[PDB]
């Protein structure tokens, strides 16, 4: 009854951040020792709780979100951040508790040339943990678009140009966000003790 962090972290293909992936971890024993003791990560930023002291504490449920962005934007996967990714693709709340783990994947998600997308246009910011997978033509003017790209009518999504010779900020990074729920229900996710 081991919690399946491996099929999230070691997945061969990741999701695009506009349609970010979420895994619901429940009813299992979680070993975070494999996470914080590894040397594979570029950033490991935890808020409100430290990964070394979860090995002895229990939650209702855990959520593991996963997606690919560019390094420039890993700054934005954090409470109190703004920018295209934090505002229109993936938003963490201000009172977020949990971890943001991120590592370079230029050798896996760069060829010679991409496949990942992100939302460019949205009339308002996302609520925390909202996922908008629309592909409706963005109406930036008064005249309705009727589903055809053109003037004042833009496709809301745009592809990253992931290419192995870019600078590291332009290179793809895989990001996993662990969030810990603790409503007052039976706690099902636990450390080894």
């Amino acid at each position: 009854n081991l919690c399946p962090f491996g099929e999230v972290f070691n997945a061969t293909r990741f999701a695009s951040v506009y349609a970010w992936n979420r895994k619901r971890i429940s009813n299992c024993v979680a070993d975070y020792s494999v996470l914080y003791n590894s040397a594979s990560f570029s950033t490991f930023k935890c808020y409100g709780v430290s990964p070394t002291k979860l090995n002895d504490l229990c939650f209702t449920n855990v959520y593991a979100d996963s997606f690919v962005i560019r390094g420039d934007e890993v700054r934005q996967i954090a409470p109190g951040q703004t920018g295209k990714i934090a505002d229109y693709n993936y938003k963490l709340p201000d009172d977020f508790t949990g971890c943001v783990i991120a590592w370079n994947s230029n050798n896996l998600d760069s060829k010679v040339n991409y496949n990942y997308l992100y939302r460019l246009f949205r009339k308002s910011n996302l609520k925390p943990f909202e996922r908008d997978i629309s592909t409706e033509i963005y109406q930036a003017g008064s005249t309705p678009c009727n589903g055809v790209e053109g003037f004042n009518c833009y496709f809301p999504l745009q592809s990253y140009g992931f290419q192995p010779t870019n600078g590291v900020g332009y290179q793809p990074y895989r990001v996993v966000v662990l969030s810990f729920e603790l409503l007052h229900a039976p706690a099902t996710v636990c450390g080894p003790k």
Partner: antibody
Amino acid sequence: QMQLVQSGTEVKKPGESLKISCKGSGYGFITYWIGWVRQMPGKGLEWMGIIYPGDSETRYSPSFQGQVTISADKSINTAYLQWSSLKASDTAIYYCAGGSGISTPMDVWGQGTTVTVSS
Amino acid sequence: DIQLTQSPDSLAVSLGERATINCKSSQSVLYSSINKNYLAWYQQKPGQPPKLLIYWASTRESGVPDRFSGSGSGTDFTLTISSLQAEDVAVYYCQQYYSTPYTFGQGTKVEIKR
């Protein structure tokens, strides 16, 4: 578990600049935020600020912002604290401390760096 | 932002007797999301750096003997030493990590009363 080791004793004249360092070694350092704490002779501890070496995100305490600079070299696992012009009032021992997240207690502590500022 | 006031400033305990230190918070430090108080207790012996004794106001760091206990919640917390031993003479600090900037207590000096 991991350990923090700071630089040696400093003795400077007023007006000179100074940069002291604090290097982390061990397993889990990627998860560690490194804060700086001042202790003036015979008095208590004062939280100065904190940095995350992975992206050098820095949060200062209002009593120390603009007074000191907290930086980091992530390739060598080192945090830095430096003054550009020391005063005699800066005479104190500075500890670097580590917590495995922000809004988490400081598990790991350096041994301390004694700084004397005197004409 | 958040301020901590310890009491008393100095404390003289006999060997084997119980030591009590109080820490009052300017502002409640309890995430009710997790239902945990973001308060820590540190010990500093002469010439030595601080050492983390207790976190989340009651949970004991590894290696700390069971004679150290943390109690309280909201704005009021206490550190308790069960049967004071000679190696426990030190200055004890409370610290809030509920939000940056972190702040320390003023510190409470604990000596042996003989």
